[PDB]
Amino acid sequence: MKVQYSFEREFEELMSDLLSKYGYEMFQMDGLGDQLDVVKFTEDFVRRGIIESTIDVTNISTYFIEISKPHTYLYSLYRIWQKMKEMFGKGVADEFVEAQINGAVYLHDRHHAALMPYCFAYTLKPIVEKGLPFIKTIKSEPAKHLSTFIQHVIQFVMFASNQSSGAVGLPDFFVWMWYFVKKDLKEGIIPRDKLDWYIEQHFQILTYSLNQPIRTTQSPYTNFTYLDRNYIKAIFEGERYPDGSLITDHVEDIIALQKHYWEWVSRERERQMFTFPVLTASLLYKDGKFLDEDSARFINKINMKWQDTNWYISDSIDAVASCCEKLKGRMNSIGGSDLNIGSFKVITVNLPRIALESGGDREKYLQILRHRVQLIKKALAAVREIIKERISEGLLPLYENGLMLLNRQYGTIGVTGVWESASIMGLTTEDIDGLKYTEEGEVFVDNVLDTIREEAEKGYHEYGFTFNIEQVPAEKAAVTLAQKDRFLFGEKQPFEIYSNQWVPLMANTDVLNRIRYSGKWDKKVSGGAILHINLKTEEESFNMVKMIADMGVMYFAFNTKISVCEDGHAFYGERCPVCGKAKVDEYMRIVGYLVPVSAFNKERREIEYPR
Amino acid sequence: MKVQYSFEREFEELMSDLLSKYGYEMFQMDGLGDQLDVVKFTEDFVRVTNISTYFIEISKPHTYLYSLYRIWQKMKEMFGKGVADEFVEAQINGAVYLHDRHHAALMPYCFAYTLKPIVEKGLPFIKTIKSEPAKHLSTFIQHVIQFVMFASNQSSGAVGLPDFFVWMWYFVKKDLKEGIIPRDKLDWYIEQHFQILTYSLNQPIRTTQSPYTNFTYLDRNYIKAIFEGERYPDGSLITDHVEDIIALQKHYWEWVSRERERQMFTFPVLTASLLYKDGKFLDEDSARFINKINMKWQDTNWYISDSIDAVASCCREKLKGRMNSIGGSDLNIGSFKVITVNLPRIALESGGDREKYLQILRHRVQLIKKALAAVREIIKERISEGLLPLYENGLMLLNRQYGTIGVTGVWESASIMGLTTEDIDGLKYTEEGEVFVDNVLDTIREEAEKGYHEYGFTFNIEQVPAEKAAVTLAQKDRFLFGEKQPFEIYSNQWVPLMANTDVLNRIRYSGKWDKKVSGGAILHINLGESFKTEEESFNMVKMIADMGVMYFAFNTKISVCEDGHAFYGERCPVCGKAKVDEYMRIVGYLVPVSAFNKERREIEYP
Ligand SMILES: [Zn+2]
Ligand SMILES: [Zn+2]
């Protein structure tokens, strides 16, 4: 049966031509093949469970999310083409569509691309002050008590996760939670002899709610930040609680509450392992010292158990000063995005493609790169115009209620496969300290990133909004791009998956090289990357941390292999110390946050070896 | 651009034939026209609602199309191609109405749950984390909210919680014992949790509509009968705490009546279930209580029953127990799917010939039973595929779910047949009309009862609320029969809500016919004037119960201001601002009329 979708003739001509040029397998690999066939999709979907049971469970709620993704992707691609045609001409639009489809670029959350924005790290201030104004079918009063505050936070997170594609960050959670803890303590709502119990009960309610998905089999991606004293002071200078008291008058209370959570979390994993919220600590570090060494030592000590917190290092708080037109502030897809910073969309450049296209010619490579990045900037501009259209149509209330801020969102140019690009270029080698870039290779990466940065900087004056760069997690992109490239270039592309760190996670190389590379290149993407290392004592750990910080790494973590039994208890080894049963899975940091390897491998294998 | 959906050739041929027979406008009216064009749909939608609604609405035509196809396949497997084809034609042309059709081959309709499994096991249907059973009130409430939200995405209709207060009391008492509640703030603490729960159930996180939930005030008899032998987690006997549970239920009803002044809201829909026999309430205290509290907003529905036999020892093979789409469904009773017969269509097909009407009716209900059987088989397949964990974890029980034969437009049907009139006490059925309605209902009853031995499961009947069906079936019939179908909308009450007729006629008809559909109906009466005293209200209630009416309510017109306060008149006593809308019970639960009529005129005049 033939169902008609109504497109402009030129777009249909474009899609037909692209089909003739590239073949159905490209469209299939892009997600615009048999996936569009509702019957095939459904029939395949309803029997995934048997296969899962045979090889290794999803429920019906996943069906209703997934069925339409190909269709809303097709729509999004079309609308982006339209807007780009409007803004820059048909040539550019056609070029973009071709690049997206053939895999020269990777449009992130493409099924959402013309409908809602990517991500944001929120301040809860408007939640505390206004309640839930974005829910228009009932007027909700602002929270007066801790329980109602926790409720509102949970509800906000769930609401926001359906108005955006990516992370819901809450860097100032504990700032606002403290207020209600103290308020309820004062009014005798909380019996004093039950204070810590009351706090931990609310930690538990929130944390578990953020790991208990109602729809689909995955919770929304959330982040918590341990704000050091420097950050609390800089961010909340001048700000007051709803009782009129100064927030900066309560730095110690906030630090103490944050500390309580990090301790409670470390304890709780032995009862039940969980992913969210992803934990980052934001520390100001200058001239060989932490400016809040108490907090740094705390994070250092507490991390010894699970290494479940990511280290954010900065040398300045200028970018966040008095925060509560050129945009500054860190944007990172994994964690550590500064308060009131986000990205409305990421479009990634496939660097290995350029390697294959260039045939080892670095000058040609850089020309191609520049052009590609300019194209991406144009697409990001179109997307932004589309989001503004959606805001105007009353479809995105988070913008209307001052929670998501469009002028505080970057347009992001992503990169993936730096290593693989260099390798195809012939600019990598193995010496005594393991796998590494050749000198010429380091220079090449320098050039790639400096070029991208140059263009990103030009973008502000070109388009009116700020661009950033990120080495994206690319859980799916890293497979699909490599697949498209293999389909196009064959044996010349020998990699099954492209990398998302400057040197591959599982590379046989010296830690010092990794650290050095991140030290060189993290600043070029303004901290839009992560160094996480698979692996002494507390002071040895601290010395390592200081060392890594001195070397200029902006965001990093150490990885352990966290065993879990069938009952969910976290431990190390093959034997569970709580229940006595055997390890059956592990949690690890694979792209920057802690996940079960089994879920990761299910996902990877099912997008890498389909049908 | 053309996008191929891969159907069996016989189905493609069928659908092409039906398109040739009925026209693109019939398909348009059915939701299988331009709605399938993603681009058109998207650009239409995009010009209250937010983006989360888009992602729900976009796929509905497509998953309806799939569900129709899959049901066709199953019916063909079970009954042959002919029967399958017949059902598809009947669904597309409006002779029948498959409810929640976008979900119909994917997940079941509704259930009234016990929270016992939640109290004892936690959230076992959420399998990516292991959740300990709640030890305390805050976590119990959390778990209840989470369960409601999870369940609302595994089913199409109501999530009933008739025994909520039975289980909430345990945790109240427990936290009070262990020093978590400071005595002096006991009622504040209870009410905080009433607030968190209630508001959560009226604050949509996705769409502009909350899940449909129900609460039931269980009288002492139902509490005793349902929970005989059952224990709380401390080993104490539930029936040892009847008075504490009653007090907690009373506390909630009093709290909600008071809260509406601060902010109006719809959910949970409130029902009071009372045992009434030989002219008296067996728990008169509860009766007088509900009667008293209803005086302000009339926000509670009266469920009246003459026996607790159906619910006896329910905690602890023809299915018995009340099923109702609005409220009052008995604990651990549900329906996996409703398919409604368009009675007006039969009237129009019959030409006024009642025997022909009855032959057609019987045939069509038989077809409906076949379709229900096929849907049930599909649900079983979904359970086997691991897709519906509420069945796996014993919250939803397939052998406690009816297949439902719905009816709508009884009145309009009788009207077209020439069987209604008007005299001094208003619009009404003639004698022949009443006999006719008896015959219709009795035919459906006969077939429902045959169903059990025919298909291995139990069938029920409901006069469905038909919020959209009542419009669309009338539109399809209008399209097919023109001036012969004079009604804009079919009725969901034995005599239409806005018909000018004596109240005694309504009560009498409900008295005659509620029993024939085993309580699968509602009588709700727009109030001329408010009741002048409690005793009067109570006399009216008792009189309604004496006549055999099984589920009923009185409607007030509740004003709201722009800030959401509930009151009466034109000016807000709270903030002084002007009335901007009204809450009323239109199909049986309290909603804003603005949204209802928006929704209605939308489907009436696209
Ligand atoms: Zn264990
Ligand atoms: Zn008011």
Author numbering:
A (entry chain B): 1 to 56, 63 to 330, 350 to 560, 565 to 640
B (entry chain A): 1 to 47, 63 to 331, 350 to 639
Give the exact sentences the study uses for this entry.
The native structure was solved from crystals obtained under three different conditions, one with the buffer molecule citrate bound in the active site, another with MES and a third with glycerol. S1 Fig Occupancy of the active site of tmNrdD by various buffer components. As in T4NrdD, the α-β barrel is decorated by an extra Zn-ribbon domain inserted between the last strand of the barrel and the C-terminal loop containing the glycyl radical site. The identity of the metal ion has been confirmed by anomalous diffraction at the Zn and Fe K edges. The Zn2+ ion is coordinated by the motif CxxxHx6CxxC [CxxCx14CxxC in the T4 and E. coli enzymes]. The tmNrdD structure contains a C-terminal loop harbouring the glycyl radical site (Gly621), which dips into the α-β barrel such that its tip meets that of the finger loop in the active site. Since the T4 enzyme structure was solved as an oxygen-insensitive Gly->Ala mutant, the present structure allows the native conformation of the radical Gly in an anaerobic ribonucleotide reductase to be observed in its resting state prior to activation, as also seen by Wei et al.. Gly621 itself is completely buried from solvent and presumably undergoes a significant conformational change in order for its hydrogen atom to be abstracted by the 5’-dAdo radical generated by the activase, as postulated previously for T4NrdD and PFL.
